[PDB]
């Protein structure tokens, strides 16, 4: 997270960390949408062009974390995947369209003060919160800078980082990339004349872009950290997966009934 802040403890109880077994390393961010399901970006598990293709046994899921590196024995919970689901039409070849993916935990997790699920939006909610100008929040343990002087510092944060960015008008988004953006994406960030900065960055992928409803006081996950051209560049914005549109697929996969 570029230009973010240390999050307060228990500020994003739905924040999940995607941990790789060997080598041990932080793969991506993710979110807990329930007792056994985790929502993340597809590109975190599969991106052929870089020979990226994780399977259920290569990863671990760590829920309830604050610190990036510590093993929070009393608070966090480590889970194993039972099955991974990637959107059938995830376009890793040209624009990362439908960059979404669900992961099914082996055993349900016990909610706590540190572990709590985020909500998925419904038609009206999406309709009224997803408006240009409105602010969303992004969280993660990714890079603090797009680039930095080697060995002179630490590109990564110690604790979970948080940033609040505004939603940008589609047209403004479209004119900022040579990429073919779809209706399954959205962009956020401040504009050059806005006076503020902020962005997600490598390591933040899969993380949730949430929004709070003033009428019910609940947090809704409206987007997923997807892709971006650098980090915190002027005249550039971050692209998020449009959770609401891909909701039927989620629905279809989950099978709560």
């Amino acid at each position: 997270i570029v230009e973010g802040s240390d999050a307060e403890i228990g500020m994003s109880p739905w924040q999940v960390m995607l941990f790789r077994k060997s080598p041990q390393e932080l793969l991506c961010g993710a979110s807990l949408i329930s007792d056994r399901w985790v929502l993340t970006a597809a590109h975190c598990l599969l991106y052929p062009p870089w020979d990226k293709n994780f399977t259920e046994n290569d990863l671990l899921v760590r829920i309830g974390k604050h610190s990036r590196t510590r093993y929070e024995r009393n608070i966090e919970k480590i889970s194993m995947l039972e099955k991974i689901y990637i959107h059938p039409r995830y376009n890793w070849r040209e624009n990362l369209d439908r960059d979404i993916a669900l992961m099914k935990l082996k055993k349900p997790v016990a909610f706590s003060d540190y572990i709590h699920p985020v909500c998925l939006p419904d038609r009206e909610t999406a309709a009224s919160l997803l408006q240009a100008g409105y602010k969303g929040r992004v969280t993660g343990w990714g890079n603090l800078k797009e680039t930095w002087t080697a060995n002179v510092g630490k590109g990564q944060p110690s604790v979970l980082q948080v940033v609040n960015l505004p939603i940008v008008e589609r047209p403004v988004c479209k004119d900022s990339t040579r990429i073919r953006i779809t209706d399954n994406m959205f962009c956020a960030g401040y504009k050059p004349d806005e006076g503020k900065r902020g962005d997600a960055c490598e390591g933040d992928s899969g993380g949730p872009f949430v929004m709070k409803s003033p009428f019910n006081n609940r947090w809704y996950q409206m987007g997923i950290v997807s892709w971006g051209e650098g980090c915190d560049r002027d005249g550039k914005y971050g692209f998020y997966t449009h959770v609401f549109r891909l909701k039927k697929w989620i629905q279809k996969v989950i099978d709560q009934f």
């Binding site: 699920p117 909500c119 929040r137 709070k212 003033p214 947090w219």
Partner: peptide, 29 residues
Amino acid sequence: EADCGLRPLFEKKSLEDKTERELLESYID
């Protein structure tokens, strides 16, 4: 049905986080 979106140490404790208002105000602009 299942509760979600209500942070156990915040909403449920009637407390708010440090930059939450920046979110809320952005609505009533």
